[PDB]
Structures are given as C-alpha cells and as structure tokens.
Amino acid sequence: GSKPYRSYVLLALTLIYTLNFIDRTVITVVAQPIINTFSLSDAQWGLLTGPPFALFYALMGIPIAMWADRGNRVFIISLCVIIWSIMTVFCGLAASFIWLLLFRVGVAIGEAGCTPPANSIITDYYPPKSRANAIGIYSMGVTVGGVMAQLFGGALAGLQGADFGNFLSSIGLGWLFSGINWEEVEGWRLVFVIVGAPGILVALILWLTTREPPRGYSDPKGKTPLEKAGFFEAFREFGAKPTFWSLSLGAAFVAFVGYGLISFQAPFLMRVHGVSVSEAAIRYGAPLAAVAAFGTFLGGFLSEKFTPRFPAIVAWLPGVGLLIAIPAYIAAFLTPSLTMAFWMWVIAAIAHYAYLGAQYTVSTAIVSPRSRATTVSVLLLIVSLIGNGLGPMFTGMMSSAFMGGIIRKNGLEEAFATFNPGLCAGRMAEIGEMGPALCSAYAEGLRQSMVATVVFLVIAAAFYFLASRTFLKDRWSPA
C-alpha cells in the first residue's frame, strides 16, 4: 500500500467493524421497548436475539469466505455495509415481529461478509513486520462498538418521534413530515434508522477512497508447502484431541450464559429497578461491556502469562473461578439495592469473561501454528452457534415459563389473557383488578430466569475441568 494512506484504509475498515458490532448489539438495549409495542413474550425476544445468527456463519460466513478469498474485497465490504445498514433501517420500520426477524436475519447475512475480506485486505496491505498490531487494533472493533452501542443507543432511545419529525422538517426534508404521525413512532425505530443510515455513505466513501491491493504482498523466499498451509487435514490435528472439544463446549456455555443475560439485562434492570431504557444502557450497559472486555483480555493475558509454565491454569485443579462467578451473579440479581447489584455485577463479569479469554488462549497452545489459526476459528464458530443461538432462547423461554408458573400458582390466567407489557410503565391500573400482581410476575419470571441461566456456568466449569484433565495428553510441544 503506502503508509499514511494504508493507515487511513485501516481506520476506515476498523470503523466499519465498530459500526458492525454497534448495529449487531444495539438490539439488546431496546429489548423492553420492542417487546412492549409488539406485546412480545420474553421467549419471542430470545428467539429474535439468538438463532437469527445461526445464519451468521453457517450460511454466508462459509460461502462468502470463499467468495472473498477469490474476489475483489473492497467492493465486497462496501456492498455488505450497504446491505446490513439498509436492513437495520428496515428493522426501524418493521410492521410485525416477523418482519423484524427477517430484517435481523438479513443483518446477519450482511455482517458475515465483513471480517474475512477485511482480514485479507489488511494482510495484503501491511508487511509482516506490522500485521499483528493492525489485526489487533482492528480486533478492538468489537470492544469499541460494544460499549459504543450501549452509549449511542441509550442516547437515541428516549427520543420523542415528534423531535425527529421536527428535525427532519427543519433541514429541508419535509418529504416525510406529511407521511406519518411522529407522535406515534417509538424511540427504538429512530435508534435503528439513525444507527443504520450512516452505513450507506460510509461504504460509498470506502469504495471511493480505498483501492484494492494486489493479492499477495507477503514474504519472498517461499517453500512449496505441497498442502497449502492447512485446509481439511489441518482439522484432523485438533479434531483428534478431546481437550479441544471440552474447551469448545465450556466456552460455548460461558457464551451461552453471556448471550442469554445480555439479551435480557436491560429488561431486568427496568422491570426490577425501574431504570429508564437510556439509563439502563448508559449507566450500566457500557460500563459492564467495558468490564466484560477487560475481563476477557485479562483472562487471555493471565493465561498467556503462565500457560507455558503449566496447563489449563487455575487454582488447585478445577476451574472454580466460574463457580465463584455464580454466587456473584445470583447476588446481583437477588439484591434490592441497585448500586450493590451493579458492583456485584462488574465483579461477576470480570470473573465470567476471564475464563472465555482463558479457554481461548489455552486452545491457542494445543495445536501447531501451521493450523492454530483454523482451530481458534472453529472454536469461535461452535461458541457462536451454541451460545448465541441457545442462550437468549433459554433465558427468554425461562422468563416466560417462570412467569407462567407464577400465573398458574396465582391463577390469574383470566387477567393475563388481556396483558400487554407496555402499559406497566405507568398506566398500571389500566390492566384491571390484577395489574401490579401480573407485572410483579412479569419481573420475577425474568429474575428467576436469569438465575436459572447462571446455573449453566456449572456445566461450563465441568467442561473446563474435563479439558484441564485431558490437556496434559493433548498438549503440543516442540520436543
């Protein structure tokens, strides 16, 4: 490439990645609003927030991996940013819950085509002396975008539709001030559309200002590897090792709990402690996201910095730091004090994401570097599928089922038959004789659900312990 122009291309692609994760994770802060207007059950919310990314990498992610390895990359990234920005805008203007699901699946379809082509671009722009730091500052995209989603979405949520209609009519775009009543549009619609709309032009300027590099700007003297690095047979190195599957299942259940909690942490915060959407996303969401990222990098470090000396590192032999994160989570949920809950939560978050980072780097040192790149990838794919697709589902169906348990044991099904979640933000008389009891059930079902999902950290710890046992055999050493 060059050097200042190359750094500009880098900043552009990293902003694409931060925007990617902003768009991806912004849906969790508008959980209660979306379910409030569409009268969704927590089950339906978990359905919306999880398996719509089984289409993340099972489809696209593997097809467009080849498509990007064989084609023009910059064009692919510009196109895909077009795609998922448009789909988020459509999420903003969804008529039914099913339309929202379809637009979210399209968002996953689009976001699958971000990291493979950008990885190829960065490796071909930069020389091997600087590729590591480039991929590192690009990897900061998930961290940045994660806390940025909470911040931006909390700000944009709690914005009256009348305000946005007036601002559109005031800058000369009165070609919508006659279309729809802005007093009747909700804040999360604005969140989606205003978050998505920058992406079209950002991808345009990407297409204009970044020239595709010639494929292959690496090292001169190259051996004919005969098996081209490693493809299917590189799988058979770790695929034989059982520690790999123990690590993958443990990390997948860690991520299962994580994705299930993030899918309903804002609904919990506003159903129990009554914080606004904005204050739940801002005073609690972004700090906990930064705390979880710090815990993940801390686990990766703490491992790396004493993993060569001895195996799946922990105190004594079982991985009971997860078992310590469990009581902190349960205490954070069962507390009536909100600040107490927040600090217990940051403690539990550090301790919970540390083992994700751990298992990550414990897997990096179990396989030859000829293939370790391909091993960590399928690790992340198993984690994504199991955790992301099943965590929100478990948490939401458990919220719905624990609520229904309160319903039956209190026998107010007659009242629930006309129960909408929306009018319990105030307007609690307007349900009937049993309004506040019904919504106490609505909050307590989610509380019990959170505790239930947290219990899955014992399954995660069991898998990590199994991996610790089989690691000595499965270890890979130069001798």
Short mmCIF file of C-alpha atoms in Angstrom, two decimals:
data_model
loop_
_atom_site.label_atom_id
_atom_site.label_comp_id
_atom_site.label_asym_id
_atom_site.label_seq_id
_atom_site.Cartn_x
_atom_site.Cartn_y
_atom_site.Cartn_z
CA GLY A 1 0.00 0.00 0.00
CA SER A 2 1.81 3.06 1.34
CA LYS A 3 1.91 4.20 4.97
CA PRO A 4 -0.42 7.15 5.76
CA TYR A 5 -2.87 6.01 3.09
CA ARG A 6 -2.54 2.45 4.42
CA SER A 7 -3.27 3.70 7.95
CA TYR A 8 -6.30 5.57 6.58
CA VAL A 9 -7.61 2.39 4.94
CA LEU A 10 -7.02 0.68 8.29
CA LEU A 11 -9.01 3.30 10.21
CA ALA A 12 -11.82 3.03 7.66
CA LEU A 13 -12.07 -0.76 7.94
CA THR A 14 -11.89 -0.60 11.74
CA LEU A 15 -14.72 1.94 11.79
CA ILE A 16 -16.65 -0.48 9.57
CA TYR A 17 -16.04 -3.18 12.20
CA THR A 18 -17.02 -0.97 15.15
CA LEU A 19 -20.16 0.03 13.24
CA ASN A 20 -20.77 -3.68 12.59
CA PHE A 21 -20.82 -4.53 16.28
CA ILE A 22 -22.80 -1.38 17.12
CA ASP A 23 -25.54 -2.47 14.70
CA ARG A 24 -25.32 -6.07 15.90
CA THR A 25 -25.60 -5.46 19.65
CA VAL A 26 -27.85 -2.36 19.69
CA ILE A 27 -30.94 -4.60 19.70
CA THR A 28 -30.44 -5.60 23.35
CA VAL A 29 -30.85 -2.07 24.74
CA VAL A 30 -34.27 -1.68 23.07
CA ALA A 31 -35.49 -5.06 24.33
CA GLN A 32 -38.33 -3.88 26.57
CA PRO A 33 -39.50 -1.21 24.06
CA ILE A 34 -39.64 -3.66 21.15
CA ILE A 35 -41.43 -6.31 23.21
CA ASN A 36 -43.68 -3.58 24.65
CA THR A 37 -45.05 -2.37 21.32
CA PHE A 38 -45.28 -5.82 19.72
CA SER A 39 -46.57 -7.35 23.00
CA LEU A 40 -43.84 -9.97 22.79
CA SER A 41 -43.12 -12.69 25.29
CA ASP A 42 -39.59 -12.97 26.62
CA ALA A 43 -39.48 -16.27 24.73
CA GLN A 44 -40.08 -14.43 21.44
CA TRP A 45 -37.34 -11.98 22.39
CA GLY A 46 -34.84 -14.78 22.94
CA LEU A 47 -35.92 -16.22 19.60
CA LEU A 48 -35.24 -12.87 17.94
CA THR A 49 -31.85 -12.32 19.60
CA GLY A 50 -30.28 -15.76 19.13
CA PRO A 51 -30.92 -18.18 16.27
CA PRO A 52 -31.14 -15.36 13.66
CA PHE A 53 -27.34 -15.65 13.74
CA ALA A 54 -27.30 -19.34 13.02
CA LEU A 55 -27.46 -17.74 9.56
CA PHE A 56 -24.43 -15.69 10.63
CA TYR A 57 -21.69 -18.19 9.78
CA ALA A 58 -23.44 -21.47 8.87
CA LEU A 59 -24.66 -19.67 5.77
CA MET A 60 -22.80 -16.76 4.16
CA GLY A 61 -19.86 -16.94 6.59
CA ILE A 62 -18.56 -20.06 4.85
CA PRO A 63 -19.88 -19.29 1.31
CA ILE A 64 -18.69 -15.67 1.28
CA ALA A 65 -15.41 -16.78 2.85
CA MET A 66 -14.62 -18.42 -0.49
CA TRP A 67 -16.30 -15.55 -2.34
CA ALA A 68 -13.94 -13.08 -0.63
CA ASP A 69 -10.85 -15.28 -0.91
CA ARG A 70 -11.42 -15.37 -4.69
CA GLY A 71 -12.82 -11.91 -5.49
CA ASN A 72 -12.48 -8.14 -5.11
CA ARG A 73 -12.53 -7.38 -1.40
CA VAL A 74 -13.13 -3.62 -1.01
CA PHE A 75 -16.18 -3.87 -3.27
CA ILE A 76 -17.48 -6.72 -1.11
CA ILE A 77 -17.13 -4.70 2.10
CA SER A 78 -18.82 -1.63 0.60
CA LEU A 79 -21.68 -3.80 -0.70
CA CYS A 80 -22.14 -5.63 2.60
CA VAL A 81 -22.18 -2.40 4.60
CA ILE A 82 -24.90 -1.20 2.21
CA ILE A 83 -26.72 -4.45 2.99
CA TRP A 84 -26.75 -4.50 6.77
CA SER A 85 -27.21 -0.74 7.16
CA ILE A 86 -30.30 -0.93 4.94
CA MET A 87 -31.53 -3.95 6.90
CA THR A 88 -31.16 -2.15 10.24
CA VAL A 89 -33.09 0.82 8.82
CA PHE A 90 -35.78 -1.69 7.83
CA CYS A 91 -35.73 -3.01 11.40
CA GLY A 92 -36.60 0.56 12.36
CA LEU A 93 -39.68 0.37 10.12
CA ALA A 94 -40.97 -3.17 10.76
CA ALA A 95 -44.74 -3.69 10.89
CA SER A 96 -44.81 -7.11 12.60
CA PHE A 97 -42.42 -9.06 14.79
CA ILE A 98 -41.86 -11.45 11.87
CA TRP A 99 -40.66 -8.58 9.66
CA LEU A 100 -38.22 -7.67 12.43
CA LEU A 101 -36.97 -11.27 12.48
CA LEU A 102 -36.46 -11.28 8.70
CA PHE A 103 -34.59 -7.97 8.74
CA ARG A 104 -32.38 -9.24 11.58
CA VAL A 105 -31.56 -12.39 9.61
CA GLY A 106 -30.62 -10.13 6.70
CA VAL A 107 -28.38 -8.15 9.07
CA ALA A 108 -26.60 -11.41 9.91
CA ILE A 109 -26.35 -12.27 6.19
CA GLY A 110 -24.64 -8.91 5.63
CA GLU A 111 -22.39 -8.92 8.70
CA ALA A 112 -20.98 -12.33 7.78
CA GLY A 113 -19.13 -10.58 4.94
CA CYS A 114 -17.10 -8.09 6.98
CA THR A 115 -14.15 -9.79 8.69
CA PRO A 116 -12.92 -12.29 6.02
CA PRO A 117 -12.39 -9.67 3.28
CA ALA A 118 -11.03 -7.07 5.70
CA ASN A 119 -8.59 -9.65 7.08
CA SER A 120 -7.37 -10.43 3.56
CA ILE A 121 -7.08 -6.70 2.78
CA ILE A 122 -5.13 -5.91 5.93
CA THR A 123 -2.74 -8.83 5.43
CA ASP A 124 -2.08 -7.74 1.84
CA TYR A 125 -1.74 -4.00 2.57
CA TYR A 126 0.66 -4.27 5.57
CA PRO A 127 4.01 -6.08 5.68
CA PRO A 128 4.56 -8.95 8.14
CA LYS A 129 6.51 -6.55 10.37
CA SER A 130 3.26 -4.73 11.20
CA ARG A 131 0.40 -7.17 10.52
CA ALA A 132 -0.03 -8.18 14.17
CA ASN A 133 -0.70 -4.68 15.52
CA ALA A 134 -3.00 -3.99 12.57
CA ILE A 135 -5.18 -7.02 13.29
CA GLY A 136 -5.04 -6.06 16.97
CA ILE A 137 -6.36 -2.52 16.56
CA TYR A 138 -8.97 -3.95 14.17
CA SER A 139 -9.93 -6.51 16.85
CA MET A 140 -10.53 -3.55 19.14
CA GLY A 141 -13.57 -3.06 16.90
CA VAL A 142 -15.75 -5.44 18.91
CA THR A 143 -14.76 -3.75 22.19
CA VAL A 144 -15.28 -0.20 20.90
CA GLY A 145 -18.53 -0.97 19.08
CA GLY A 146 -19.77 -2.91 22.10
CA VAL A 147 -19.54 0.00 24.52
CA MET A 148 -20.46 2.45 21.74
CA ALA A 149 -23.70 0.58 21.06
CA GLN A 150 -24.79 0.99 24.66
CA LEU A 151 -23.84 4.69 24.66
CA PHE A 152 -25.33 5.64 21.28
CA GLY A 153 -28.46 3.54 21.71
CA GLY A 154 -29.13 4.84 25.21
CA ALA A 155 -28.82 8.37 23.87
CA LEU A 156 -31.03 7.76 20.82
CA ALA A 157 -33.55 5.79 22.87
CA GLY A 158 -35.83 8.07 24.82
CA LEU A 159 -36.04 10.43 21.83
CA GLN A 160 -39.59 11.51 21.02
CA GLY A 161 -40.62 10.81 17.45
CA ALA A 162 -42.02 14.34 17.34
CA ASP A 163 -38.48 15.67 17.85
CA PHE A 164 -37.11 13.63 14.94
CA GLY A 165 -40.00 14.60 12.67
CA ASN A 166 -39.42 18.26 13.50
CA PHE A 167 -35.67 17.99 12.90
CA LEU A 168 -36.33 16.30 9.55
CA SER A 169 -38.81 19.02 8.60
CA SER A 170 -36.36 21.74 9.68
CA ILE A 171 -33.38 20.75 7.49
CA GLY A 172 -35.46 20.71 4.30
CA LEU A 173 -36.61 17.07 4.36
CA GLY A 174 -40.31 17.84 4.67
CA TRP A 175 -40.90 14.88 2.35
CA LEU A 176 -41.70 12.81 5.45
CA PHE A 177 -43.43 15.40 7.67
CA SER A 178 -46.60 14.72 5.66
CA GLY A 179 -46.23 10.93 5.56
CA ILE A 180 -46.66 9.60 9.11
CA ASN A 181 -47.53 10.93 12.55
CA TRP A 182 -44.28 11.27 14.50
CA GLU A 183 -46.05 11.31 17.88
CA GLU A 184 -46.90 7.64 17.22
CA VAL A 185 -43.43 6.38 16.23
CA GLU A 186 -41.40 4.90 19.08
CA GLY A 187 -37.84 5.70 20.06
CA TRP A 188 -36.31 2.37 19.07
CA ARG A 189 -37.42 2.96 15.47
CA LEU A 190 -35.32 6.13 15.48
CA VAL A 191 -32.50 4.18 17.12
CA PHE A 192 -32.44 1.62 14.31
CA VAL A 193 -32.80 4.07 11.42
CA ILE A 194 -30.31 6.67 12.68
CA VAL A 195 -27.79 3.94 13.52
CA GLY A 196 -28.13 2.28 10.10
CA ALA A 197 -28.32 5.30 7.79
CA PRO A 198 -24.62 6.36 8.10
CA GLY A 199 -23.53 2.99 6.74
CA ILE A 200 -24.65 3.52 3.15
CA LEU A 201 -22.47 6.60 2.71
CA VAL A 202 -19.65 5.14 4.82
CA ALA A 203 -19.48 2.16 2.47
CA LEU A 204 -19.63 4.51 -0.51
CA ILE A 205 -16.63 6.53 0.70
CA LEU A 206 -14.91 3.20 1.40
CA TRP A 207 -15.49 2.19 -2.24
CA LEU A 208 -14.10 5.55 -3.37
CA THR A 209 -11.07 6.07 -1.11
CA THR A 210 -9.58 2.57 -0.73
CA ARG A 211 -8.01 0.88 -3.76
CA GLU A 212 -7.88 -2.90 -3.74
CA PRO A 213 -4.31 -4.09 -3.11
CA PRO A 214 -2.67 -6.71 -5.33
CA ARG A 215 -3.34 -10.09 -3.73
CA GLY A 216 -0.03 -11.27 -2.31
CA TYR A 217 2.29 -8.76 -0.65
CA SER A 218 3.96 -11.04 1.91
CA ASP A 219 7.35 -12.86 2.19
CA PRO A 220 9.82 -13.53 -0.68
CA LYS A 221 11.51 -16.92 -0.30
CA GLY A 222 8.61 -19.35 -0.04
CA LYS A 223 8.67 -23.12 0.26
CA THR A 224 6.15 -25.04 -1.83
CA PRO A 225 4.05 -26.25 1.12
CA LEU A 226 2.51 -29.02 -1.04
CA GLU A 227 -0.54 -29.00 1.28
CA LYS A 228 -1.07 -25.18 1.11
CA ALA A 229 -0.88 -24.35 4.83
CA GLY A 230 -3.78 -26.46 6.05
CA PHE A 231 -7.40 -26.98 5.00
CA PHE A 232 -9.35 -30.18 5.77
CA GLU A 233 -6.37 -32.11 7.18
CA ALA A 234 -5.43 -29.23 9.49
CA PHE A 235 -8.78 -30.00 11.14
CA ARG A 236 -7.63 -33.55 11.91
CA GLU A 237 -4.86 -32.25 14.20
CA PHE A 238 -7.21 -30.81 16.82
CA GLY A 239 -10.21 -32.91 15.76
CA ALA A 240 -8.50 -35.90 17.36
CA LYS A 241 -7.79 -34.04 20.61
CA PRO A 242 -10.61 -34.27 23.20
CA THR A 243 -9.34 -31.24 25.14
CA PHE A 244 -10.37 -29.19 22.12
CA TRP A 245 -14.00 -30.29 22.41
CA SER A 246 -14.01 -29.89 26.19
CA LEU A 247 -12.68 -26.34 25.80
CA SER A 248 -15.14 -25.57 22.99
CA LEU A 249 -18.15 -26.81 24.96
CA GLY A 250 -17.09 -24.98 28.12
CA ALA A 251 -16.54 -21.74 26.21
CA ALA A 252 -19.82 -22.27 24.35
CA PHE A 253 -21.67 -22.50 27.66
CA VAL A 254 -19.85 -19.45 29.05
CA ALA A 255 -21.04 -17.61 25.93
CA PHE A 256 -24.46 -19.26 26.33
CA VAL A 257 -24.89 -17.61 29.73
CA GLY A 258 -23.41 -14.36 28.41
CA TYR A 259 -25.68 -14.09 25.37
CA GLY A 260 -28.71 -15.12 27.41
CA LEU A 261 -28.03 -12.43 30.00
CA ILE A 262 -27.21 -9.58 27.60
CA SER A 263 -30.44 -10.41 25.76
CA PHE A 264 -32.49 -9.60 28.87
CA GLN A 265 -30.30 -7.47 31.17
CA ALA A 266 -31.98 -4.20 30.17
CA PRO A 267 -35.49 -5.71 30.61
CA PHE A 268 -34.36 -6.99 34.02
CA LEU A 269 -32.93 -3.61 35.03
CA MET A 270 -36.14 -1.79 34.10
CA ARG A 271 -38.62 -4.42 35.32
CA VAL A 272 -36.99 -4.75 38.75
CA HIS A 273 -35.15 -1.48 39.39
CA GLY A 274 -37.20 0.69 37.03
CA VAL A 275 -34.26 2.39 35.33
CA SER A 276 -35.11 4.04 32.04
CA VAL A 277 -34.02 2.48 28.75
CA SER A 278 -31.36 5.18 28.40
CA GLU A 279 -30.03 4.95 31.95
CA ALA A 280 -30.02 1.15 31.79
CA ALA A 281 -27.94 1.26 28.60
CA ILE A 282 -25.64 4.11 29.70
CA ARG A 283 -25.10 3.96 33.46
CA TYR A 284 -24.93 0.15 33.38
CA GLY A 285 -24.67 -1.22 29.84
CA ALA A 286 -21.49 0.41 28.55
CA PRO A 287 -19.63 0.04 31.89
CA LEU A 288 -20.48 -3.66 32.06
CA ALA A 289 -19.47 -4.09 28.41
CA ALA A 290 -16.11 -2.47 29.11
CA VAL A 291 -15.79 -4.61 32.26
CA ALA A 292 -16.52 -7.79 30.29
CA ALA A 293 -14.00 -6.85 27.59
CA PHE A 294 -11.43 -6.10 30.30
CA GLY A 295 -12.17 -9.47 31.89
CA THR A 296 -11.79 -11.24 28.54
CA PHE A 297 -8.46 -9.59 27.73
CA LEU A 298 -7.46 -10.19 31.37
CA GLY A 299 -8.23 -13.89 31.09
CA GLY A 300 -6.34 -14.09 27.81
CA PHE A 301 -3.37 -12.35 29.42
CA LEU A 302 -3.39 -14.17 32.79
CA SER A 303 -3.47 -17.40 30.81
CA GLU A 304 -0.78 -16.47 28.24
CA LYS A 305 1.49 -15.17 31.03
CA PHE A 306 1.64 -18.54 32.86
CA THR A 307 0.14 -21.06 30.42
CA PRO A 308 3.57 -22.12 29.08
CA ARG A 309 4.64 -22.95 32.64
CA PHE A 310 1.76 -25.37 33.35
CA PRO A 311 -1.59 -26.32 31.76
CA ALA A 312 -5.19 -25.02 31.85
CA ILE A 313 -4.27 -22.56 34.56
CA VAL A 314 -6.39 -22.08 37.69
CA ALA A 315 -6.09 -22.54 41.45
CA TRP A 316 -5.60 -26.17 42.57
CA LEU A 317 -7.01 -28.22 39.65
CA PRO A 318 -10.70 -27.37 38.98
CA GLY A 319 -11.72 -24.22 37.18
CA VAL A 320 -13.81 -22.89 40.08
CA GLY A 321 -13.50 -19.21 39.20
CA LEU A 322 -16.68 -19.76 37.21
CA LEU A 323 -18.15 -21.37 40.33
CA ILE A 324 -17.19 -18.16 42.15
CA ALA A 325 -18.79 -16.02 39.43
CA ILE A 326 -22.07 -17.89 40.03
CA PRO A 327 -22.83 -16.56 43.56
CA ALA A 328 -21.89 -13.03 42.50
CA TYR A 329 -24.43 -13.19 39.66
CA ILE A 330 -27.14 -14.62 41.91
CA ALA A 331 -26.41 -11.91 44.49
CA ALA A 332 -26.57 -9.20 41.83
CA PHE A 333 -30.00 -10.45 40.77
CA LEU A 334 -31.49 -11.02 44.23
CA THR A 335 -30.50 -7.62 45.63
CA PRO A 336 -32.96 -4.74 46.08
CA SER A 337 -30.04 -2.28 46.06
CA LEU A 338 -29.19 -1.19 42.52
CA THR A 339 -25.65 0.06 43.16
CA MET A 340 -24.86 -3.09 45.15
CA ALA A 341 -26.17 -5.09 42.19
CA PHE A 342 -24.04 -3.06 39.77
CA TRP A 343 -20.79 -3.66 41.64
CA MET A 344 -21.56 -7.34 42.27
CA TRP A 345 -22.25 -7.47 38.51
CA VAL A 346 -18.91 -5.98 37.50
CA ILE A 347 -17.19 -8.48 39.81
CA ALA A 348 -19.10 -11.38 38.26
CA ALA A 349 -18.43 -10.04 34.75
CA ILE A 350 -14.66 -9.89 35.21
CA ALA A 351 -14.69 -13.40 36.70
CA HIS A 352 -17.03 -14.72 33.99
CA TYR A 353 -15.27 -13.44 30.87
CA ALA A 354 -11.82 -14.28 32.26
CA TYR A 355 -12.47 -17.95 31.53
CA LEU A 356 -13.59 -17.17 27.97
CA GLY A 357 -10.26 -15.44 27.38
CA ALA A 358 -8.52 -18.32 29.17
CA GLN A 359 -10.05 -21.13 27.09
CA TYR A 360 -9.30 -19.01 24.00
CA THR A 361 -5.56 -18.91 24.69
CA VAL A 362 -5.46 -22.43 26.20
CA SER A 363 -6.75 -23.56 22.81
CA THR A 364 -4.14 -21.44 21.04
CA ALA A 365 -1.42 -23.53 22.72
CA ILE A 366 -2.67 -27.06 22.00
CA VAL A 367 -2.10 -27.11 18.24
CA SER A 368 0.80 -26.47 15.88
CA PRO A 369 0.94 -22.92 14.43
CA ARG A 370 0.53 -24.49 10.97
CA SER A 371 -3.15 -24.82 11.90
CA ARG A 372 -3.88 -22.92 15.16
CA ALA A 373 -5.46 -20.12 13.09
CA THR A 374 -8.01 -22.60 11.73
CA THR A 375 -8.61 -24.11 15.19
CA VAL A 376 -9.48 -20.89 17.02
CA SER A 377 -11.92 -20.10 14.18
CA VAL A 378 -14.00 -23.26 14.55
CA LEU A 379 -13.79 -22.74 18.31
CA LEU A 380 -15.46 -19.36 17.81
CA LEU A 381 -17.99 -20.92 15.42
CA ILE A 382 -19.07 -23.55 17.96
CA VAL A 383 -19.24 -20.80 20.59
CA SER A 384 -21.34 -18.58 18.30
CA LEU A 385 -23.80 -21.31 17.30
CA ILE A 386 -24.38 -22.93 20.70
CA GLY A 387 -24.07 -19.87 22.93
CA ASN A 388 -25.60 -17.13 20.79
CA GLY A 389 -28.39 -19.25 19.32
CA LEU A 390 -29.41 -21.00 22.54
CA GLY A 391 -28.64 -18.57 25.38
CA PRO A 392 -31.26 -15.93 24.60
CA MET A 393 -33.69 -18.76 23.82
CA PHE A 394 -33.12 -20.39 27.22
CA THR A 395 -33.30 -17.09 29.11
CA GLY A 396 -36.45 -15.94 27.31
CA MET A 397 -38.32 -19.22 27.46
CA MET A 398 -37.33 -19.45 31.14
CA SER A 399 -38.65 -15.94 31.78
CA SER A 400 -41.90 -16.86 30.02
CA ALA A 401 -42.17 -20.20 31.84
CA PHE A 402 -41.34 -18.85 35.31
CA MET A 403 -43.88 -16.09 34.70
CA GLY A 404 -46.43 -18.72 33.68
CA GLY A 405 -45.61 -20.60 36.87
CA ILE A 406 -46.45 -17.51 38.90
CA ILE A 407 -49.58 -17.16 36.73
CA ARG A 408 -50.81 -20.69 37.44
CA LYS A 409 -49.88 -20.76 41.13
CA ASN A 410 -51.71 -17.43 41.47
CA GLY A 411 -54.38 -18.50 38.96
CA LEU A 412 -54.84 -15.16 37.16
CA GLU A 413 -54.86 -16.51 33.59
CA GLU A 414 -58.09 -14.55 33.06
CA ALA A 415 -56.08 -11.38 33.69
CA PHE A 416 -53.08 -12.48 31.61
CA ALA A 417 -55.36 -13.08 28.60
CA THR A 418 -55.50 -9.26 28.24
CA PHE A 419 -51.98 -8.48 29.49
CA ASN A 420 -49.76 -6.20 27.43
CA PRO A 421 -46.26 -5.50 28.80
CA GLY A 422 -46.27 -1.91 27.56
CA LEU A 423 -48.79 -0.25 29.86
CA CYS A 424 -46.97 -1.30 33.05
CA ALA A 425 -44.64 1.67 32.55
CA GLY A 426 -47.13 3.74 34.48
CA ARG A 427 -50.76 3.04 33.42
CA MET A 428 -50.77 0.03 35.76
CA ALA A 429 -54.40 0.48 36.76
CA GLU A 430 -55.35 0.09 33.09
CA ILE A 431 -54.98 -3.70 33.20
CA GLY A 432 -57.72 -4.47 35.71
CA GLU A 433 -58.15 -5.82 39.22
CA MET A 434 -54.81 -7.65 38.99
CA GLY A 435 -52.39 -5.28 37.27
CA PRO A 436 -49.49 -4.92 39.70
CA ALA A 437 -49.57 -8.63 40.58
CA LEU A 438 -49.40 -9.54 36.88
CA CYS A 439 -46.41 -7.27 36.35
CA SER A 440 -44.69 -8.42 39.54
CA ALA A 441 -44.95 -11.80 37.84
CA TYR A 442 -43.56 -10.26 34.64
CA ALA A 443 -40.47 -9.05 36.52
CA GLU A 444 -39.98 -12.07 38.79
CA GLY A 445 -40.17 -14.56 35.93
CA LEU A 446 -37.22 -12.80 34.30
CA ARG A 447 -35.36 -12.67 37.64
CA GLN A 448 -35.75 -16.43 38.20
CA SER A 449 -34.82 -16.93 34.53
CA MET A 450 -31.54 -15.05 34.96
CA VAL A 451 -30.64 -17.17 37.98
CA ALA A 452 -31.55 -20.36 36.09
CA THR A 453 -29.31 -19.47 33.14
CA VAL A 454 -26.49 -18.50 35.51
CA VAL A 455 -26.65 -22.07 36.84
CA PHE A 456 -25.34 -23.23 33.42
CA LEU A 457 -21.93 -21.93 34.47
CA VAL A 458 -21.64 -25.21 36.40
CA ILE A 459 -21.85 -27.05 33.07
CA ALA A 460 -19.23 -24.66 31.69
CA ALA A 461 -16.96 -25.31 34.68
CA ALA A 462 -17.44 -29.07 34.31
CA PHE A 463 -16.27 -28.86 30.70
CA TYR A 464 -13.29 -26.69 31.68
CA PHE A 465 -12.33 -29.23 34.37
CA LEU A 466 -12.55 -32.05 31.82
CA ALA A 467 -10.27 -30.07 29.50
CA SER A 468 -7.82 -29.50 32.35
CA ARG A 469 -7.60 -33.25 32.89
CA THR A 470 -7.10 -34.21 29.24
CA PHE A 471 -4.81 -31.26 28.43
CA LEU A 472 -1.52 -32.85 29.55
CA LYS A 473 -2.01 -35.56 26.93
CA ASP A 474 -3.39 -33.15 24.34
CA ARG A 475 -0.55 -30.62 24.78
CA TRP A 476 1.72 -29.87 21.82
CA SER A 477 5.45 -29.36 22.39
CA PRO A 478 8.44 -28.86 20.07
CA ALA A 479 10.30 -31.77 21.69
#
